[PDB]
Amino acid sequence: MRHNTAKIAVNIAVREQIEAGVGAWRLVTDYEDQSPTSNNQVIRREPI
């Protein structure tokens, strides 16, 4: 979650909850080695 794409999803969550009444975020799994974790698989939080 070093990548800032995770922190964008946190800002959307709290903002749109107050305004629109809903906000969303997703957890996905992809292949990266720019912030590697075990078995060369990482879990990223992506904004919605």
């Binding site: 959307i12 903002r15 749109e16 720019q34």
Partner: protein
Amino acid sequence: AGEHIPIVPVFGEWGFVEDKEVYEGVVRLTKDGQRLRNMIMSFNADIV
């Protein structure tokens, strides 16, 4: 030389109202009232 984009844009207010990016500073809706004040000011200035 970069492996990532060297340009990281800041956004003061940010969001997607339909998945077309909309953003603003703070001067967006000050346009309406300010010109209204100036209009009243220049009505009576011509009378004086």
